[PDB]
Amino acid sequence: LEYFTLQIRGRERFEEFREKNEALELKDAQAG
Amino acid sequence: MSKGEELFTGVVPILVELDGDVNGHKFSVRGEGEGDATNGKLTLKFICTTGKLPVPWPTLVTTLTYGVQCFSRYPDHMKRHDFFKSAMPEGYVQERTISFKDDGTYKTRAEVKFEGDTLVNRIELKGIDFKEDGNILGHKLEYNFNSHNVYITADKQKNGIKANFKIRHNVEDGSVQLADHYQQNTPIGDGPVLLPDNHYLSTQSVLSKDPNEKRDHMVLLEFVTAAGITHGMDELYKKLGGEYFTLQIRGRERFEEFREKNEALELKDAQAGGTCFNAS
């Protein structure tokens, strides 16, 4: 478990990265 | 706004060519006229070049001219949402399924692009499973076309847009024949395009005849305007489109993957001097 931050330019690009990142985290966070 | 907006600043000549096949009835339609995007205006005359049209003219309107939606008028603050002009000059592919309730289905594929100074819409149409005595093959539809609102949404996976709307064809018996439209547009070129937030196109049409025209034909005047997003919302979009956002990533490899894609994207912008970033 180690956190990192990424600077994303603009709403459109950020919403795309955040959506993919959230989908990934909803597989490790289901108790696994 | 896109670089392609400059191509629609004046009157643009339009050519439409359709090859169709409905239940084996083959036909071809040619249309020519002008589009005036500044006023959301297009004027076209269509000709059936193979004899009598085997389907009613109103059933082809959306394929022929909601086939050149790059002539829609986007209000100034909504021009950041105009996918259609952004794909020009290279153009876009427009695909539809049109499902007539209790009757057949149209499937269409079109290329809309500039060829020289002319905007050209070339269409292939396949119609299957129509009732030989139905409202379409039986020519039971009135020669009119009501106003519609075409719902447009972004399709980022394919770098394009989708649209869904239901057309209400008046039948001569007084009832209505529904035409369920499913639409996909994708750019032909590999250059950057505008992907819109949710909005709709408000369309208006009047159908007429040319008294001097001997062939089976349709005359069309159409006004189309984008709508649905306020000026205040687009000012927000414009601000947010320029800001930096911090994304928090869990895991070194997952971070490394996001970072390389982010760096690639910022590299694309910088190589094009940023000319396409957060375009109004």
Number of CB pairs, chain A paired with chain B, less than 8 A apart: 71
Q: CA B19 → CA B108, B115, B182, B236, distances in Å? A: 10, 19, 20, 45
Domain coverage including residue B158: 3-234
Chain A contact probe: residue of B156, B237, B245, B259 with most A CBs at under 10 A: B245
Task: Tell me if A15 sits within 8 A of B262, measured CB to CB.
Answer: no
Give which of B236, B26, B251 is closest to A2, Cα–Cα: B251
Q: Which residues of B touch A1 (CB under 8 A)?
A: 250
User: How far does the CA of residue A11 sit from the closest CA of chain B (Å)?
Assistant: 5
Q: Pairing mode, if any, of strands B160-170 and B148-155? A: antiparallel
Residue at B254 is within a domain: no
For residue A7, what is the enclosing H or E element? strand A3-9
What are the DSSP E strand ranges found in chain B? 12-22, 25-36, 41-48, 92-100, 105-115, 118-128, 148-155, 160-170, 176-187, 199-208, 217-227, 244-250
3-state secondary structure of B267: helix
Residue at B250 is within a domain: no
Residue at B77 is within a domain: yes
Q: How was this structure determined?
A: X-ray
Backbone angles phi, psi at B122, to 5 degrees: -110, 125
Give the C-alpha separation, B55 to B61, whole Å: 11
Q: What CATH number is given to the structural domain containing B119?
A: 2.40.155.10
Backbone angles phi, psi at B175, to 5 degrees: -75, -170
Residue at B36 is within a domain: yes
| Inter-chain residue contact B241 with A10, CB threshold 8 Å | yes
Give the C-alpha separation, B159 to B186, whole Å: 6
Task: Tell me if B90 sits within 8 A of B188, measured CB to CB.
Answer: yes
Q: How many domains does chain B have?
A: 1
Give the C-alpha separation, B163 to B167, whole Å: 13
3-state secondary structure of B130: coil
Give the C-alpha separation, B134 to B211, whole Å: 29
Q: ∠ CA(B75), CA(B78), CA(B81), 5° rounding?
A: 130
User: How far does the CA of residue A26 sit from the closest CA of chain B (Å)?
Assistant: 12
> Residue B247 is nearest to which of A1, A5, A11, comparing CB atoms?
A5
Residue at B23 is within a domain: yes
Q: Which residues of A touch B237 (CB under 8 A)?
A: 11
3-state secondary structure of B246: strand
Residues whose CB is less than 8 angstroms from the CB of residue B222 and which lie 6 or more positions away in sequence, other chains included:
B41, B42, B43, B44, B65, B203, B204, B205, B206
| Inter-chain residue contact A14 with B247, CB threshold 8 Å | yes
3-state secondary structure of B253: helix
Roughly how many angstroms between the first and final C-alpha of chain B, as a whole number? 4
Task: Tell me if B86 sits within 8 A of B193, measured CB to CB.
Answer: yes
| Inter-chain residue contact A16 with B156, CB threshold 8 Å | yes
Residue at B144 is within a domain: yes
- State whether the Cα torsion B146-B151-B178-B211 is positive or negative: positive
Residues whose CB is less than 8 angstroms from the CB of residue B189 and which lie 6 or more positions away in sequence, other chains included:
B87, B90, B91
Residue that is written with structure tokens 């060519």 in the block = B17
Buried b / exposed e along B238-276 (16+ C-beta atoms within 10 A): eeebeeebebebebeebbeebeeebeebbeebeeeeeeb
Alpha helices in chain B, H assignment, sequence order: 61-64, 83-86, 231-240, 252-271
Residue at B246 is within a domain: no
Residue at B25 is within a domain: yes
